Amino acid sequence: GALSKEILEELQLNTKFTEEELSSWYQSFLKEDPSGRITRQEFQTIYSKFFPEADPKAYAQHVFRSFDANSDGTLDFKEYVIALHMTSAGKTNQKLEWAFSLYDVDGNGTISKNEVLEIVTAIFKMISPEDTKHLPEDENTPEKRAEKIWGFFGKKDDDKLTEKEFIEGTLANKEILRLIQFEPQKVKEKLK
Numbered sequence: 503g504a505l506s507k508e509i510l511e512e513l514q515l516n517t518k519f520t521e522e523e524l525s526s527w528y529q530s531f532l533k534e535d536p537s538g539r540i541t542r543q544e545f546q547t548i549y550s551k552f553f554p555e556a557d558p559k560a561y562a563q564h565v566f567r568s569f570d571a572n573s574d575g576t577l578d579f580k581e582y583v584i585a586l587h588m589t590s591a592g593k594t595n596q597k598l599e600w601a602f603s604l605y606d607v608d609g610n611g612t613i614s615k616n617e618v619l620e621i622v623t624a625i626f627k628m629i630s631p632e633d634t635k636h637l638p639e640d641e642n643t644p645e646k647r648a649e650k651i652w653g654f655f656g657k658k659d660d661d662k663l664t665e666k667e668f669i670e671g672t673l674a675n676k677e678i679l680r681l682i683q684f685e686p687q688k689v690k691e692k693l694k
């Protein structure tokens with residue numbers, strides 16, 4: 503029941519659901535997954551089903567990991583609902599702390615150049631083959647996009663990017679926001 507309250511607590515104005523609606527979704531969730539827990543592979547299946555034009559396995563794995571920096575174990579209903587909101591609802595700039603957790607692949611508290619490339623590659627694979635030709639030349643491969651992000655942050659190859667700086671840059675430089683953007687529809691849309 504009151505798992506819905508803590509979901510609302512953590513999404514706040516990001517929510518697309520009332521407490522009653524979340525409880526309804528939860529009861530349906532329990533019919534299909536009675537433990538109230540979903541594994542990474544079950545989570546990946548949701549994205550595979552709903553992004554048929556793409557190759558969403560890596561993306562879904564990184565989103566799952568954003569909760570804990572762990573590929574093992576499960577998400578509960580709260581984390582599952584929050585995950586779907588992060589990928590698919592609301593405004594990117596209301597998600598910046600979560601975005602830091604997405605990009606900090608190993609969970610060590612800072613983002614490295616390789617981590618940016620890993621996440622940018624996973625997001626890139628969410629784009630349909632048809633759409634990637636609308637990409638600007640200097641943003642049309644994962645390497646180009648990740649290096650542009652790293653350059654906008656003023657970083658050398660072995661530098662570390664902190665949460666403070668990530669939040670600042672993603673707020674202030676709209677090119678950084680556009681390039682780190684992780685919601686597939688928003689990448690698609692801005693492209694078009």
Ligand SMILES: [Ca+2]
Pocket residue numbers: 606607608609610611612613614617
């Ligand atoms: Ca890291």
